[PDB]
Amino acid sequence: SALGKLQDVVNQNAQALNTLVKQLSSNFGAISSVLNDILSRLDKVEAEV
Amino acid sequence: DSFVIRGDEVRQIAPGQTGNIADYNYKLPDDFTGCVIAWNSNNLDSKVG
């Protein structure tokens, strides 16, 4: 535990990138989070929305 | 731009549509600035037989 002041700086920067990547799975209220899925389900004007 | 069409297919005369009229007869651009005006012409354009 004594060296943990450097280890926490490593941990926060790993957690920050994992949070940034996990947010690719979110819909944000869209029909899907997968971009090719949106473009397969819907025609151009609705897919753009 | 002027033509006769079937009353059902008038919906294809709009930006970002797909179908036999949209893709094989008359295609509007997605960023269209304009007005689409239609009227029924059964008294002019139909024939007995």
Within 10 angstroms of residue A44's Cβ, the number of other Cβ atoms is 13
Smallest CA-to-CA distance from A38 within A25, A48, A24 is with A48
Outline where DSSP puts E strands in A1-49: none
The label of the residue with tokens 């007005």 reads: B35
The answer to whether the CB atoms of A43 and B30 lie below 8 A apart is no
CB contact, 8 Å: A5 with chain B?
no
Residues of A in contact with B30 (CB under 8 A): 44-45
The label of the residue with tokens 């005006």 reads: B37
Residues of B in contact with A43 (CB under 8 A): 16-18
- How was this structure obtained? cryo-EM
Tokens of A22: 């996990």
